[PDB]
């Protein structure tokens, strides 16, 4: 409940060794979430 | 059908006679058994789409009927189904005035009659597996179930 708050921070893989986990999240719930409720989850901007 | 299958398995060692005659089998009669597979699937997915949250979004209207083109469009976009699995899916789905479907009731049509003979499959095809092992062709038949 307390990690819910990194989800949309742009600095959520910092002091860790990867640094795209959000998006292969995002690439393989995608197709579940219409990647645009991932995106907001996450926090990230699909065009950016 | 299947239970004569299962009957006939009944018995047997490993890579036997009879295993090994219903390998042929299967793969004599691939493309019958690839489209029963593929129609199990197809509504098993059908009906797990039908709860997802993005479909739920894309149905609009009040009455909880989901259009034809936004639910061709929403199975497009969860890009689970191809092309003709979603024409198909649309001929399956029952047309309302202006083609309007309902959706809870397309998902549980036809799941509560084909879960027996699903699962006698599925009972036929782990038993197979499981007796014949190192077998490509039961390998793939167990990749499309």
């Given at each position: 409940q307390w990690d819910r708050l990194v989800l949309n921070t742009p600095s959520f893989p910092s002091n860790y060794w990867d640094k795209f986990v959000k998006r292969k999240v995002l690439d393989k719930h995608g197709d579940i979430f219409g990647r645009e409720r991932i995106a907001e989850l996450l926090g990230m901007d699909l065009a950016s | 059908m299947v239970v004569m299958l299962?009957?006939?398995?009944?018995?047997?060692?490993?890579?036997?006679?009879?295993?090994?005659?219903?390998?042929?089998?299967?793969?004599?009669?691939?493309?019958?058994?690839?489209?029963?597979?593929?129609?199990?699937?197809?509504?098993?997915?059908?009906?797990?789409?039908?709860?997802?949250?993005?479909?739920?979004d894309y149905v609009t209207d009040p009455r909880g009927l989901i259009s034809k083109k936004d639910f061709q469009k929403a199975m497009d976009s969860q890009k689970q189904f191809t092309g003709p699995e979603i024409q198909f899916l649309l001929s399956c789905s029952e047309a309302d005035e202006n083609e309007m479907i309902n959706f809870e009731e397309f998902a549980n049509?036809?799941?509560?009659?084909?879960?027996?003979?699903?699962?006698?499959?599925?009972?036929?095809?782990?038993?197979?597996?499981?007796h014949v092992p190192h077998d490509p062709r039961l390998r793939n038949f167990l990749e499309l179930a």
């Open positions: - | 299962l009957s006939l398995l009944e018995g047997n060692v490993v890579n036997g006679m009879i295993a090994r005659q219903m390998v042929d089998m299967l793969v004599e009669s691939s493309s019958n058994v690839e489209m029963i597979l593929k129609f199990f699937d197809m509504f098993l997915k059908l009906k797990d789409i039908v709860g997802s949250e993005a479909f739920q049509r036809f799941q509560e009659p084909a879960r027996d003979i699903g699962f006698n499959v599925a009972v036929l095809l782990t038993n197979l597996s499981e």
